[PDB]
Amino acid sequence: KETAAAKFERQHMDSSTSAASSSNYCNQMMKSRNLTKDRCKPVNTFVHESLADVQAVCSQKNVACKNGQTNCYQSYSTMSITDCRETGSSKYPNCAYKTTQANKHIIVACEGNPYVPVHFDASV
């Protein structure tokens, strides 16, 4: 299984593109990253950075995760994120998304050795 840090990578990292170049970027992109291989995942976010850049968020500002958990961290600078939200009924295998390209600060849930983003939580 694609656990914690690898699952973050799978779900989020899109470094090859600096931004959602299309209003339908998420539709295709979601597929290639294994996210929609069985079911069309209702909501997800891509993050247009390297892993190294996002590891850098884990030691900026400590925050609470959306549930209340103490192990989420925010960057002092805005990051290029692409929110992928299902539109017009996301059916398998023709998964249908609405794409948002935004430059917002990110909350990554971090741990491990070396200390790495394991889960993405919120863009603020």
Side-chain angles (χ1 to χ4, degrees), residues 100-120:
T100 299
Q101 177 46 65
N103 290 60
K104 290 192 281 173
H105 303 253
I106 61 144
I107 274 109
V108 279
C110 308
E111 60 213 279
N113 184 48
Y115 207 91
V116 304
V118 293
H119 307 304
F120 186 90

Side-chain angles (χ1 to χ4, degrees), residues 4 8 19 22 26 30 35 37 52 58-59 62 66-67 69 75 78 82-83 91 99 101 104 118 122:
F8 177 86
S22 174
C26 283
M30 278 290 280
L35 293 159
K37 206 60 67 64
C58 300
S59 300
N62 166 259
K66 60 183 177 181
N67 60 350
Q69 241 300 101
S75 55
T78 60
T82 296
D83 190 67
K91 298 175 292 291
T99 309
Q101 177 46 65
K104 290 192 281 173
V118 293

